[PDB]
Copies of this chain bind each other. A is one copy, B any other.
Amino acid sequence: QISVRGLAGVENVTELKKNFNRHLHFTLVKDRNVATPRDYYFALAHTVRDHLVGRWIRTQQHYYEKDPKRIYYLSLEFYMGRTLQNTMVNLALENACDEATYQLGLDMEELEEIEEDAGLGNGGLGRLAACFLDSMATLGLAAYGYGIRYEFGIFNQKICGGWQMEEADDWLRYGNPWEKARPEFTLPVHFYGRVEHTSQGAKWVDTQVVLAMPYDTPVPGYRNNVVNTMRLWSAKAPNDFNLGYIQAVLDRNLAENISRVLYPNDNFFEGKELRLKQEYFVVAATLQDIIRRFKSSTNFDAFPDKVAIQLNDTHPSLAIPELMRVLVDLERLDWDKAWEVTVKTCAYTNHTVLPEALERWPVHLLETLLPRHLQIIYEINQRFLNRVAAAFPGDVDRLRRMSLVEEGAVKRINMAHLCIAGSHAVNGVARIHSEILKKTIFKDFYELEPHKFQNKTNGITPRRWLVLCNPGLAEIIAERIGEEYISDLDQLRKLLSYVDDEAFIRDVAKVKQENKLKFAAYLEREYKVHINPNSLFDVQVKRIHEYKRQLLNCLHVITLYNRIKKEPNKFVVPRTVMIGGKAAPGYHMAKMIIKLITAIGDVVNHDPVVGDRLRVIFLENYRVSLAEKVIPAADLSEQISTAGTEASGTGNMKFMLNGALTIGTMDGANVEMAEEAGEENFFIFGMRVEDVDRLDQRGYNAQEYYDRIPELRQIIEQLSSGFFSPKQPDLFKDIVNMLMHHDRFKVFADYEEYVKCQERVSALYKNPREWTRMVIRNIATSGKFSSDRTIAQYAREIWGVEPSRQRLPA
């Protein structure tokens, strides 16, 4: 049908059809008479998977023969979403499969909806790892993603009575056609035990052993015939485990629990033993695999020349003392040489400045679980602090501030400090964030080793986040400027010469309208909710968090409702306000915010006076596959975190690429987005980081705002009195109390500017031609935010490898 989806040649379509029928028969053991849509999905998935394997085998053979420097991306999260369409896109198979399935009497889009998301992440950090894998393969890097194969990913969110309910994400129930179990490459991982000191060094003995079994998933590059590997470890008990008889077999579950479930916290540290085990499990198995592959090419001098390890936040920070452990205890290298190798090998990416999100592990936990690692950490600390003392003599407070060991009621290890000490590069994820790191939490470290600190602004892959989810837009762009932009997103700048092109303006607006119609139909079919497709689609989708200020959005929504009720017969630009995202199960305030949103909808959506001028919808079970649907349909992107709190954001970039305008604070990547597009083409409001600091020094008093803004007072009175909860008048008392007395994120402080900025949004939307021209100016300048750019910077500035756009032979 459309150009960017590739060729549907007679030869290919015929071959795809027969292999589909072969898989249906031999693989699924079904015939067309008993086959269900799910069977048809799996037949297609297996058929598409077949096209990967040849390229997969020859890619890994190529790396063996050429022996390039290998990049190991260590992450506790890989938020992959669905794989079928992505594989078709990257292999140029989409139109051929569409044709083949059509001729078999099947609708491919219907089959695509059957695939479960691989929801092995919480939000931005997990999704970044996924975009990164895509970009590294597209840039021809010898890269491996290493993580955990969670049996249960991020929970499925149900909304019941307006409340979030969690259910297990049993994503493997029907099987995963993409993965290949590699039980032959199973590795032992050690826990507990004790340290013995011998004549010939330290020994870690009397340990409990858990097996790490790898599962490999192919990661195709965009039409370059490169297929890299994501290797995810699964925990297995050894066969002599606890070996009355029956209970001993049943107790195998204890060991295998390590890989059972993803901790469902976004940007929040939960110091539980099981989480620590997960973190060591991935690190220990990965490092053995790395060293094995390195030896199969004695001389560890060349280790950093052949290996780079990227730590996705501090979650895999134990890689540092584990590498030291292996090099010192097992390979018998002296400390100094081992340390040199470790530092040159490891690099660390920080994703947050929120105190509650930073990993600080109780010493007593590490003492029991990983006794040798604690000793190594202590030794690292001593030697590091000796360097600090030499550089800043007599500065005793600096010594306590920089220590990896934090003193107090419970002694803790600051994992970020460990990461900085043991890495040759430390980066933030957006320019403002990286600057904040150097000025605040890592200031001391920056002063000691300024060369270590870098910025690498985040990005998103234009394959998934444009071509896949928005083929209509990708096509109208390709009609003008060709297909090259898909792997060179900077080329979208060429679209600036079309900002006054009446044909292009109409087409851009047409694509949006179609996307909005498709999504409006999705909502009625799957959730029985009615929306006006001509309204402004005002969307905030992201994890529920106080810092992300879904509450500020709520206040605006209520303001709009109150203004309508005050002047019913006055014209207002119609809006559909969509808010979605999951709350961590233990995060009470976030769960309350979800209830507030649904409660507002319950009043707003049923008020006859409002009509269809205002609708408030909570988007249930927000996840990668839902993002791919809602983002192309959005007109307005809400990126309204308190300045200085959102390290980057990546959802913001997805909306920009897909033709939404952005209302946002100057926070994270928003700053660079506005810079690229021009501030005139962005809806910027609110305090800057400097203004937040000024308010903190003075003392934030929320009552002041309540006293001076009558519209804000009305809302708070409504919340308190039970306007949005008539049967439970005090339901939102916790929310009001927080807003009035202990709001860390200054919701009230940005309220006035937010509401005024929103008025300017509605004004522009009244002029469809000028709205669309601003949209074009956004899409045209979104190039910087391709993860291809991000990965190229990591490659050149951290990993010391050169990206390659060259095809491998097919």
Contacts and interface: CB of A to CB of B under 8 A. Distances in A.
Nearest to A585: B245
Interface in A253-281: 253, 257, 260-261, 263-264, 272, 274
Interface stretch (A95-103, A168-176, A367-375): A168-176
B245 A264 contact: yes
B167 A174 contact: no
A390 interface: no
Contacts of A274: 246
A257 B246 CA distance: 10
Contacts of A50: 26
Given A50-B26, A249-B261, A165 B56 contact: no
Stoichiometry (number of copies)? 2
Interface stretch (A180-188, A303-311, A712-720): A180-188
A250 B260 CA distance: 7
B252 A257 contact: no
A586 B245 CA distance: 8
Nearest to A257: B250
A713 to B, nearest CB: 38
Interface stretch (A84-92, A235-243, A431-439): A235-243
A81 to B, nearest CB: 20
Nearest to A39: B184
A683 B204 CA distance: 61
A111 to B, nearest CB: 16
A233 to B, nearest CB: 15
A261 B272 contact: no
Q: Which of A25, A156, A168, A244 has the most CB of B within 10 A?
A: A168
A168 B249 contact: yes
A244 B591 CA distance: 15
A167 B246 contact: no
Contacts of A165: 243
A216 B54 CA distance: 31
A563 to B, nearest CB: 40
A260 to B, nearest CB: 6
A166 interface: yes
B29 A180 contact: yes
B53 A31 contact: no
Given A29-B180, A245-B264, A167 B239 contact: yes
A53 B26 contact: yes
A392 B585 CA distance: 67
Nearest to A584: B245
B29 A243 contact: no
B29 A245 contact: no
B38 A56 contact: no
Mostly, the A contact residues are mixed
Nearest to A186: B173
Nearest to A56: B29
A547 interface: no
A180 B42 CA distance: 14
A261 B239 contact: no
Contacts of A198: none
A36 interface: yes
Nearest to A150: B249
A30 B216 CA distance: 13
Contact of A246 (B244, B253, B263): B263
Contacts of A57: 25, 29-31
Contacts of A180: 29
A168 B246 contact: no
Contacts of A166: 243, 245
A184 B173 CA distance: 10
A33 to B, nearest CB: 8
A752 B75 CA distance: 73
A152 interface: yes
B152 A249 contact: yes
A519 interface: no
Given A168-B241, A249-B168, A38 B175 contact: no
A155 interface: yes
A154 to B, nearest CB: 11
A260 B155 CA distance: 25
Contacts of A586: 244-245
A53 B26 CA distance: 6
Nearest to A261: B249
A246 B265 CA distance: 11
A744 B491 CA distance: 91
Interface in A1-35: 25-26, 29-31
Contact of A53 (B29, B243, B260): B29
Interface in A673-690: none
A243 B170 CA distance: 13
Contacts of A263: 246
Interface string A52-70: 0110110001000000000
A731 to B, nearest CB: 23
A181 to B, nearest CB: 7
A357 B53 CA distance: 53
A785 to B, nearest CB: 34
Given A26-B50, A57-B29, A168 B243 contact: yes
A56 B26 CA distance: 11
17 contacts: A25-B54, A26-B50, A29-B56, A36-B184, A156-B239, A166-B243, A167-B240, A168-B239, A168-B252, A170-B239, A173-B236, A175-B183, A245-B264, A245-B585, A246-B261, A246-B274, A253-B257
Interface of A: 25-26, 29-31, 36, 38, 50, 53-54, 56-57, 61, 152, 155-156, 165-168, 170, 173-175, 180-181, 183-184, 216, 236-237, 239-241, 243-246, 249-250, 252-253, 257, 260-261, 263-264, 272, 274, 585-586
Q: 5 closest Cβ contacts across the A-B interface?
A: A245-B585, A253-B253, A249-B261, A167-B239, A168-B239
Given A26-B53, A156-B239, A168-B240, 17 more contacts: A25-B54, A25-B57, A26-B50, A29-B180, A31-B57, A36-B184, A38-B184, A155-B245, A166-B245, A167-B239, A167-B243, A168-B239, A168-B243, A168-B249, A246-B263, A246-B272, A250-B260
